[PDB]
Subunit: 82 residues, 2 copies
């Protein structure tokens, strides 16, 4: 019905993404029915995405989306529990 564990742990994401230099979160969505969080972010380079994926992977199932350069690099992440 609705994923409360992801809702709780989502509270750690601002502080976590906050540790990554040159990573701007432009949006993020929690979907309780799927228990996922999807995050869009941008940087001046790819390397902040690598740092973010590795950090998110410690406590989440992370999938990185495509990274595209516009001089901004744009990408996304899908998080699920684990």
């Amino acid at each position: 019905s609705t994923d409360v564990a992801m809702l709780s742990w989502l509270a750690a994401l601002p502080a976590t993404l906050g540790q990554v230099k040159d990573l701007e979160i432009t949006s993020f969505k929690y979907d309780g029915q799927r228990g996922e969080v999807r995050i869009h972010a941008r940087s001046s380079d790819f390397q902040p995405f690598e740092q973010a994926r590795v950090k998110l992977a410690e406590k989440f199932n992370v999938e990185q989306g495509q990274l595209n350069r516009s001089n901004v690099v744009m990408g996304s992440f899908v998080l699920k529990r684990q």
Copy 2:
């Protein structure tokens, strides 16, 4: 460009909405460009929405959306800074 203060304070929303009995968060979205958070939730009654609005209003600019009954009551909130 991107609203970091809302990103930070968004971390308090799960714990806050969590205090409200019979309020299920089905989704929520942060938009950094607008610096808003939009939340959809459901309950068995209207009263949890009242409790949630009042609590959110302490630290956010809150607008409650329409509440509609399906036996589930469905509504939403838009939060901005203040």
